[PDB]
Design an enzyme around this catalytic site. Structure first.
Site, PDB file in Angstrom:
ATOM      1  N   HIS A   1      33.729  92.986  46.888  1.00 25.65           N
ATOM      2  CA  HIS A   1      33.333  94.294  47.379  1.00 25.65           C
ATOM      3  C   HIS A   1      31.839  94.350  47.734  1.00 25.65           C
ATOM      4  O   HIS A   1      31.409  95.230  48.468  1.00 25.65           O
ATOM      5  CB  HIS A   1      33.655  95.353  46.339  1.00 25.65           C
ATOM      6  CG  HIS A   1      35.109  95.656  46.198  1.00 25.65           C
ATOM      7  ND1 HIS A   1      35.875  96.152  47.234  1.00 25.65           N
ATOM      8  CD2 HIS A   1      35.922  95.593  45.120  1.00 25.65           C
ATOM      9  CE1 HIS A   1      37.097  96.383  46.791  1.00 25.65           C
ATOM     10  NE2 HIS A   1      37.157  96.058  45.514  1.00 25.65           N
TER      11      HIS A   1
ATOM     12  N   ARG B   1      36.626  88.924  43.329  1.00 27.70           N
ATOM     13  CA  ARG B   1      38.057  88.692  43.174  1.00 27.70           C
ATOM     14  C   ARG B   1      38.453  87.292  43.596  1.00 27.70           C
ATOM     15  O   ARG B   1      37.886  86.700  44.513  1.00 27.70           O
ATOM     16  CB  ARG B   1      38.877  89.658  44.046  1.00 27.70           C
ATOM     17  CG  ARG B   1      38.631  91.123  43.817  1.00 27.70           C
ATOM     18  CD  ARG B   1      39.164  91.625  42.472  1.00 27.70           C
ATOM     19  NE  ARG B   1      38.960  93.049  42.330  1.00 27.70           N
ATOM     20  CZ  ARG B   1      37.920  93.616  41.736  1.00 27.70           C
ATOM     21  NH1 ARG B   1      36.990  92.878  41.161  1.00 27.70           N
ATOM     22  NH2 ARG B   1      37.802  94.925  41.721  1.00 27.70           N
TER      23      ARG B   1
ATOM     24  N   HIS C   1      46.342  93.230  41.419  1.00 28.45           N
ATOM     25  CA  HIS C   1      46.710  94.184  42.465  1.00 28.45           C
ATOM     26  C   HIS C   1      47.217  93.413  43.687  1.00 28.45           C
ATOM     27  O   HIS C   1      46.806  92.279  43.922  1.00 28.45           O
ATOM     28  CB  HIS C   1      45.495  95.000  42.901  1.00 28.45           C
ATOM     29  CG  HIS C   1      44.991  95.964  41.881  1.00 28.45           C
ATOM     30  ND1 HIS C   1      43.813  96.653  42.063  1.00 28.45           N
ATOM     31  CD2 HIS C   1      45.486  96.372  40.696  1.00 28.45           C
ATOM     32  CE1 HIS C   1      43.608  97.451  41.041  1.00 28.45           C
ATOM     33  NE2 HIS C   1      44.600  97.294  40.187  1.00 28.45           N
TER      34      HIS C   1
ATOM     35  N   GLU D   1      45.495  89.806  44.016  1.00 30.47           N
ATOM     36  CA  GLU D   1      44.107  89.587  43.691  1.00 30.47           C
ATOM     37  C   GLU D   1      43.851  90.031  42.257  1.00 30.47           C
ATOM     38  O   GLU D   1      44.528  90.903  41.700  1.00 30.47           O
ATOM     39  CB  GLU D   1      43.171  90.246  44.720  1.00 30.47           C
ATOM     40  CG  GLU D   1      43.403  91.689  45.033  1.00 30.47           C
ATOM     41  CD  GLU D   1      42.598  92.660  44.207  1.00 30.47           C
ATOM     42  OE1 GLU D   1      42.047  92.274  43.160  1.00 30.47           O
ATOM     43  OE2 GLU D   1      42.551  93.841  44.623  1.00 30.47           O
TER      44      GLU D   1
END
Ligand SMILES: Nc1ncnc2c1ncn2[C@@H]1O[C@H](CO)[C@@H](OP(=O)(O)O)[C@H]1O
Ligand SMILES: [Ca+2]
Ligand SMILES: [Ca+2]
Ligand SMILES: [Cl-]
EC number: 4.6.1.20
Length: 114
Positions: free
Chosen positions: A101, A85, A41, A62
Site C-alpha cells: 500500500h 503483502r 484476503h 494475499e
C-alpha cells in the site's frame, strides 16, 4: 515463480524467509481474530495498479508481509498487518508477487515491490 532473495516494499526490505513465512502462515491459517475479514484476503488484478504476477492463473490471495512472522491474530490479539503483502495462488501456495500500500496510486491501492 521462485521466491526472491529480497524485496523492497515501499522502503521495507524483506527476505525470502519473510516471504515464505507469510505464505506458510496464510496456508496454516494463523489469522483467527475477530476481524470479520481475517487474513488472508482475496487479491484481484486491477490493471491501473501496474502489478505483474509471476504465478499462473488465479484465484489469488494475499497475506501480510511482516518481520519475524508470520503475521497472526487471535481473539483480542493482533499483530499489525502493516502496508506490505505477499500474493500467492490460493489453490497451491505458489508465490506470485510482493506488493504494498505504500506509495500506491490511489486510496487502498497496491503497487508492486521491487
Ligand atoms: N488489487 C487490489 N488492490 C487493492 N486492494 C485489493 C486488491 N485486491 C483485493 N484488495 C482488497 O481490498 C482491500 C483494500 O481496500 C485489501 O485489503 P488489505 O488492504 O490488504 O487489508 C484487499 O482485501
Ligand atoms: Ca483466517
Ligand atoms: Ca496486472
Ligand atoms: Cl486478521
Amino acid at each position: 515463480c521462485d521466491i526472491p532473495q529480497s524485496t523492497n516494499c515501499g522502503g521495507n526490505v524483506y527476505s525470502n524467509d519473510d516471504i515464505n513465512t507469510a505464505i506458510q502462515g496464510a496456508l496454516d491459517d494463523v489469522a483467527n481474530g475477530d476481524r470479520p475479514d481475517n487474513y488472508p484476503h482475496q487479491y484481484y488484478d486491477e490493471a491501473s495498479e501496474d502489478i505483474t504476477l509471476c504465478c499462473g492463473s488465479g484465484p489469488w490471495s494475499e497475506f501480510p508481509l511482516v518481520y519475524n512472522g508470520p503475521y497472526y491474530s487471535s481473539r483480542d490479539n493482533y499483530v499489525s498487518p502493516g502496508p506490505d503483502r505477499v500474493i500467492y495462488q490460493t489453490n497451491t501456495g505458489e508465490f506470485c508477487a510482493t506488493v504494498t500500500h505504500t506509495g500506491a496510486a490511489s486510496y487502498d491501492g497496491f503497487t508492486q515491490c521491487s
